[PDB]
Amino acid sequence: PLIVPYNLPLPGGVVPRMLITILGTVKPNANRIALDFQRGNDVAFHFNPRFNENNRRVIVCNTKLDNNWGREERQSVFPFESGKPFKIQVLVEPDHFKVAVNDAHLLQYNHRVKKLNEISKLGISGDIDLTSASYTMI
């Protein structure tokens, strides 16, 4: 049981074949969740489930540079359900982050920030009860 918002240090940044696992439970009337993989103040990879944007559920992903959001990447495949236990796995690959939820592939996001070994924090926020956050090499 971890207090949200939660900061997970990623020592020496990320690297291909590093797997980051987030476990928790979605709150009963959730509206939003966010994962923010940060390089200093920049956000290399923002992963943002939205449960009610114009009465649709959507995943929004983006990058923040010098305090400005860039081009959003959107999709309607949406695996989360309010009130349920979830697992998000983010696997760093050479050209992209890959995300799987509850053991089903969800999306990939190409690397816009290229200094991977400087992406040294993961922020976890929004409408969840967070159980644990950790990493391993596969």
Ligand X SMILES: OC[C@H]1O[C@@H](S[C@@H]2O[C@H](CO)[C@@H](O)[C@H](O)[C@H]2O)[C@H](O)[C@@H](n2cc(Sc3ccccc3)nn2)[C@H]1O
Residues that bind ligand X (CB under 6 A): 32, 34, 46, 48, 60, 62, 69, 72, 125-126
- Smallest distance, Å, CB 51 to ligand X? 11
Q: Work out how close the CB of 58 gets to ligand X at its nearest, in angstroms, rounded to a whole number.
A: 9
Q: What is the end-to-end Cα distance of the chain in Å, rounded?
A: 25
The residue (of 69 and 134) whose beta carbon lies closer to ligand X is: 69
Output the known binding site.
69-75
User: 70, 80, 75, 82: which is closest to 111 by C-alpha?
Assistant: 70
Query: Of 2 and 18, which CB lies nearer to ligand X in the complex structure?
Result: 2
**CA–CA distance, 81 with 24 (Å, rounded to integer):** 12
Euclidean distance between CA atoms 12 and 28, whole angstroms: 36
Nearer CB in complex with ligand X: 19/58: 58
